[PDB]
Design a protein around this ligand. Structure first.
Ligand SMILES: O=P(O)(O)O[C@H]1[C@H](OP(=O)(O)O)[C@@H](OP(=O)(O)O)[C@H](OP(=O)(O)O)[C@@H](OP(=O)(O)O)[C@H]1OP(=O)(O)O
Ligand SMILES: [Zn+2]
Lengths: 369, 511, 135, 514
């Protein structure tokens, strides 16, 4: 059958970003707690990720930056003002106790999943803890400290000729796209909202440079895209990318901040529309890796990721929520699926058609494998 | 036109013909007093007027001149329902279009222009009367508007008398007013603190014999409402990095006292006060997206839909007419000005995008006026990639969703604060200058200011509350909290007591 | 989009002849805590989970982690369940009252909470706070 | 609006009404015409009786004001007789005075001009002068000379002088030329007559008409004679099928409706824009990705010269020539990164230095640029929308070079896309795809479509338009093998006549300059 390895750690749920900070890593804990109660863990291999040492993290990040990260503590905050100015650690990414432990857990989960997937032991590896994709080579940004998507991809490149990275988070995956902007071995496809949104990159004309020309794909979207439009723009573009690029592994960043009703995201996707993307990607029968990242309405994130892990196992799950430790958090409807909002779709048919045709014209110039 | 050729045959329309005709008529009628053909006598003074322009300007004069009576054919016509000064002012308006309106004779001009069917002057006199209404003559203006069937002025007088119902209790004209007027002012919704029950019982007790039958109808038509003279203050303490939201309640004694105080764990980029609710935007900001709504009763925080785009120093304008909150202009995190306009539906908790602005501004002052949003000042986009202080006026019509920049320019530029009072926009800029902006006539009237403001060049925040204009100081000294009330009728300034809040920095003052 | 050696990653070269050696020489960088067993009925597992949760107080994760220790032996796990106590964070009633006071005073600032509860680590305080907020 | 200190909106202020003028005008028009009330003075013309109001007449015309205020009994008489003006022209004048619109036509234009000069109606007189300058031809240029000289009108006189001196050779045998006053001949020859017209023959014929009286003026006429050279031209820039080098042809327009080639030149680079300044040609080109080189071609020497490079790289930008400031303007255009540019720069021929000025309201690329008494008009083109792509545009943008201020007209063109515009007299003729020609008047802000024969409908080919000596020539963009169709368009009757004498080995006509 299909083997799925799930990487969870019981300590990653005890890290606090700060007072009123949007990113609460505790959302992972009830994501696991839903998994333990739906009975999905019966058909899943559960592993505990090791703590990746600083040597594993230096493959992409500069050594001084990681030395700062492992040396910075809140109790000696004032002693590294120049470092915080240089390394962009501060209001964006607050210093909290266990910062380096959290980074180690995330990157260890991603790298261990990449190694296990790289030995042909398993076909789908699920690591909701990691997925941080905004951190640059030598500076943190967007609540992301250590870029673990790029480390996981670099681990996959040791055996796979071409690795395709698929993004569905509302924001542009600027860290990983920057990391592989001049490489023809990794094709990064990102669906995001353009305009004033963070980080204000990923224009339609950003198609890489050097050897990586036409090997980076960006799909700029607008406010309030619905399930039907998202599916109708995801399926054909993905089909063309897989037909032209012909990858050997897929790394999917199942960002859950594109859902309807987040604290930060302004899309209109429901849980079914979000899981349809993962189901479509999973059907191509490629060594596939799923990571989380993003998502800031915690209950919606837990529901979405429980469904994502349910669709990975091809297991149908009841719509009602069984009693668990966090039952009171999901009230008062007490249902797994979430209804869409009344937001007006600003993605007109002509806009999507023109963008898709432009992307198709760009993809035709990609050399044959 | 397809059938017209500019070399053989075409039509010619002159765009300056109306102005030329008007100027020629004014010059020939006033300067030389030529071609006079009808004589009007008012209080013994003889006016030589032209029947053509009078008949073209007003319907009453046309009707009187076209009649078959001998008086219409008579050279001299007498008028006894007007005075000399008022009729002279009317003739000045008819022949020139420029009239000097004074408060002493506004009632007379309002009555006479209604009699002579001068529509524009009647409308302007109605607006001036609606501005000038106070607690002293609210019921007299009620009577006047009801007599002349003016809905706007009647509504303004009703709003002014309803909110001061307790003070009107011991006046003869309140006891003598008919039942319908009292029913109208009561059914509009009296605030709870005014005690409408006392008003009803006193009105009944004035003449019990002839008025008892209306008790049940008055009680059935009675409707009551609660308190919203709130002025919201958002500030940051010197020793704290979080935000404090203080809501002040204004008393009839002109003392301002704190009714509540809230603390928010996030920085705030913009804020607006919609109805009685306070909305703030701020997200630990390289990310201005989150919004929170505070209700006075709950003393808590409720998160609303995030912004469709994250912009710095945008203007949040509350539009109660459409039940929407508008975000206009603002900088981007890349220091590029943005001209996007987005409005938030309070009922549906859904954002939407509308037509962009003509000129991108950041940090402007937004004022809502009868459903039209004015963007005052800000910072334009200088051609050489930088930004400069701006003075242009932008008008956004929410009903039509069409924006256009006014050809006029403000006396000053830079950052400014706008407070809407009655039918005017009061704008306070740097350098202790106060400007009263009338958008209908599109003219400015600078208000004199006491020399005590010249000690420091600090910015001033302006807020309007229950018909009074309050001017606040942005920077508060330790133990020195000065709030200046302004009387726009006489340009007087009065210091207000009772305010003691440890707000070193007043970020936003909301009316 | 920035391009330069100080921004991009160093992509390794692909050697087809080296595929069969590196993987077999690298150890699995993860510890296995559960693996599926196809010879075990779901009803028996449900009964064992219910017994562990009710009679012995074991939580969902610990009971299954212990069951895997005996190679999916339900009888041995049930026999050895009372022999091991599932050590929790020993939060007494006084500790709960003190943490409630700390949350009431300093809010979710766990560093200030740790001042009045020096024996409890920040991670322990954060773990307790999210379980306490359910009520 | 100044901030008045002594005015406040709660005690005392001045109320100024801005709808008063329109209300007064509309009411007075309605009362005076639809109802016909308050008739005061009576005017009789050729037995027809009109009822008019002395107030309106004295308000709009000074002649009527002076006539009505006279102390003579005729002013106080009820009836007044006018014998100089025809009944129909006076009806038109009354219509203009009261309503404000009048249906001008060519048959009554001279009479309306003269009468409006008599009655001191300045606006109608100026419009009639403009419309008479538009319709001037070689057949009545001397009559317009005499009229504008009698009426002391400088603009019409200058236009008639230009038309007459640019066609002096055709006026050699005309009877009006023989009777021309000596002052008019002095002015027509001293303004600068092209040497091809043989002015000396004109002087000889004028003297030979009446030698016994015109002999004394011979020396004065010869001394004041001023001559300039010859360059009636319409540069054609294009590419041949068999060559990759652009070939520029300079055609000479003869007086007998024949266009003859005066010379040709070839350039070894791609050109993205071109303009005609005075008697010289300017092209902007350069190899990809550096199209920022100017090349100046002199027709006298048939040689290329280097000029100041463009300040920034652009594609499909519009080049117009403004002889008032002796400058060449570059408007709009596309960047090498596929982004529409609103930057405007202008080049001074005298100083050979480029300078940047204020930007446009909306950036356009490939829009048509037309010059008008110093005001530069941008028509059509492409505008960017939804959101990174370009859409055919129909906006008209006006660039006033005196104040360096640009605006957007509220109206829009009847069509959109790429278009070619050539200014004619006071009008802008625009030709776009679909065999559509529109005559655009900026003063009255109106368009008139021009009917065109169905011979254009054989193929859906674009057209280029040019102006030469007041004659409109329209060319086909694509030439078939041995087929080079050029039409002379007469806008008075919308007549199209096939011209001859042109041999052109061009396949694609990239640009046509006039
Ligand atoms: O999910 P909820 O039960 O609605 O409550 C959360 C929770 O606050 P409370 O548990 O005190 O209600 C968050 O706080 P923490 O658990 O992280 O301490 C708080 O976030 P902040 O602490 O960052 O303020 C967030 O509020 P917000 O999203 O406005 O930041 C707030 O949710 P509500 O906004 O719905 O009350
Ligand atoms: Zn995200």
């Amino acid at each position: 059958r299909r083997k799925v390895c799930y990487y969870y750690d019981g300590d990653v749920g005890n890290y606090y970003y700060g007072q009123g900070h949007p990113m609460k890593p505790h959302r992972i804990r009830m994501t696991h707690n839903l998994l333990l109660n739906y009975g999905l863990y019966r058909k899943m291999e559960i592993y505990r990720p090791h703590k990746a040492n600083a040597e594993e993290m230096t493959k992409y990040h500069s050594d001084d930056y990681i030395k700062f990260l492992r040396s910075i503590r809140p109790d000696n905050m004032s002693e590294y003002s120049k470092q915080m100015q240089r390394f962009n650690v501060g209001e964006d990414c607050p210093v909290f106790d266990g910062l380096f432990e959290f980074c180690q857990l995330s990157t260890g989960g991603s790298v261990a999943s990449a190694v296990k997937l790289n030995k042909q032991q398993t076909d789908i590896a699920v690591n909701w803890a990691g997925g941080l994709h905004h951190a640059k080579k030598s500076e943190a940004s967007g609540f992301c400290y250590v870029n673990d998507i790029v480390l996981a991809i670099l681990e996959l490149l040791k055996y796979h000729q071409r690795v395709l990275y698929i993004d569905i988070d509302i924001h542009h995956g600027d860290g990983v796209e920057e990391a592989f902007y001049t490489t023809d071995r990794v094709m990064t496809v990102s669906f995001h909202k353009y305009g004033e949104y963070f980080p204000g990159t990923g224009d339609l004309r950003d198609i890489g440079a050097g050897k990586g020309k036409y090997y980076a794909v960006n799909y700029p979207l607008r406010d309030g895209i619905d399930d039907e439009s998202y599916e109708a723009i995801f399926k054909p573009v993905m089909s063309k990318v897989m037909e032209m690029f012909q990858p050997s592994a897929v790394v999917l960043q199942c960002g859950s901040d594109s859902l309807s009703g987040d604290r930060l995201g302004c899309f209109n996707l429901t849980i079914k529309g979000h899981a349809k993307c993962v189901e479509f990607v999973k059907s191509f029968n490629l060594p596939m890796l799923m990571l989380g990242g993003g998502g800031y309405t915690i209950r919606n994130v837990a529901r979405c990721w429980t469904y994502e892990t349910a669709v990975a196992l091809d297991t149908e799950i009841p719509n009602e929520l069984p009693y668990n430790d966090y039952f009171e958090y999901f009230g008062p409807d007490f249902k797994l699926h979430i209804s869409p909002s009344n937001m007006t779709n600003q993605n007109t048919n002509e806009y999507l058609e023109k963008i898709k045709q432009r992307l198709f014209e760009n993809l035709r110039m990609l050399p044959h494998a | 036109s397809m059938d017209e050729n500019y070399f053989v045959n075409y039509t010619f329309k002159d765009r300056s013909h109306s102005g030329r005709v008007a100027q020629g008529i004014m010059k020939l009628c006033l300067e030389e007093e030529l071609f006079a053909d009808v004589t009007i006598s008012v209080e013994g003074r003889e006016f030589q007027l032209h029947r053509l322009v009078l008949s073209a300007q007003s319907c009453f004069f046309r009707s009187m001149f076209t009649s078959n009576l001998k008086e219409a054919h008579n050279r001299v016509i007498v008028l006894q329902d007007v005075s000399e000064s008022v009729f002279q002012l009317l003739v000045d308006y008819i022949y020139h279009g420029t009239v000097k309106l004074r408060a002493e004779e506004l009632q007379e001009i309002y009555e006479v222009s209604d009699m002579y069917q001068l529509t524009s002057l009647f409308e302007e006199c109605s607006r001036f009367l609606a501005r000038t209404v106070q607690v002293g003559n609210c019921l007299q203006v009620m009577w006047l508007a009801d007599r002349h069937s003016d809905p706007e002025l009647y509504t303004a007088a009703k709003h002014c008398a309803k909110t001061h119902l307790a003070q009107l209790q011991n006046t003869e004209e309140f006891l003598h007013l008919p039942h319908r007027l009292l029913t109208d002012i009561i059914s509009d919704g009296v605030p709870c603190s005014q005690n409408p029950t006392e008003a009803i019982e006193a009105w009944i007790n004035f003449n019990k014999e002839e008025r008892e039958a209306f008790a049940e109808s008055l009680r059935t038509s009675l409707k009551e409402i609660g308190e919203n003279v709130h002025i919201y203050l958002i500030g940051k303490e010197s020793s704290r990095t979080h935000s404090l939201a203080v809501s002040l309640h204004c008393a009839e004694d002109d003392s301002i006292s704190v009714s509540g105080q809230n603390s928010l764990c996030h920085q705030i980029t913009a804020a607006c006060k919609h109805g009685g609710d306070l909305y703030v935007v701020g997200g630990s900001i390289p990310r201005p997206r989150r919004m929170w709504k505070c209700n006075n009763a709950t003393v808590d925080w409720e998160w609303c839909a995030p912004l469709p785009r994250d912009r710095l120093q945008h203007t949040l304008v509350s539009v109660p007419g459409k039940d929407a909150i508008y975000s206009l202009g603002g900088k981007t995190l890349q220091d590029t000005l943005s001209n996007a306009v987005i409005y938030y539906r309070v009922g549906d908790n859904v954002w939407t995008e509308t037509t962009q602005l003509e000129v991108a501004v950041s940090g402007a002052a937004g004022a809502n006026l009868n459903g039209i949003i004015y963007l005052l000042g800000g910072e334009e986009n200088d051609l050489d990639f930088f930004t400069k202080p701006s003075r242009l006026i932008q008008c956004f019509d929410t009903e039509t969703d069409k924006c256009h920049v006014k050809p006029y320019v403000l006396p000053f530029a830079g950052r400014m604060h706008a407070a809407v009072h009655k039918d005017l926009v009061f704008i306070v800029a740097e350098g202790d200058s106060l400007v009263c902006y009338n958008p209908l006539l599109d003219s400015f009237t600078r208000l004199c200011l006491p020399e005590a403001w010249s000690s420091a060049p600090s910015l001033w925040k302006i807020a309007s509350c229950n018909g009074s204009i309050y001017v606040f100081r942005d920077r508060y000294k330790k133990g020195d909290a000065n709030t200046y009330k302004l009387d726009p009728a006489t340009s007087a300034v009065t210091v207000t007591r009772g305010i003691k809040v440890l707000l070193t920095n007043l970020q936003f003052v909301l009316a | 989009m920035r391009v330069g050696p100080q921004y991009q990653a160093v992509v390794p070269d692909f050697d087809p002849a080296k595929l069969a050696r590196r993987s077999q020489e690298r150890d699995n960088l993860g510890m296995l805590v559960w693996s599926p067993n196809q010879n075990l009925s779901e009803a028996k597992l449900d009964e064992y989970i219910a017994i562990a949760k009710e009679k012995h107080g074991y939580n969902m994760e610990q009971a299954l982690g212990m069951l895997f220790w005996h190679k999916h032996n339900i009888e041995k796990s049930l026999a050895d369940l009372p022999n091991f106590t599932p050590f929790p964070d020993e939060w007494t009633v006084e500790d709960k009252v003190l943490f409630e006071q700390a949350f009431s005073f300093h809010g979710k600032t766990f560093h200030r909470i740790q001042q009045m509860l020096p024996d409890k680590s920040i991670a322990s305080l954060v773990k307790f706070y999210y379980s306490w907020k359910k009520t």
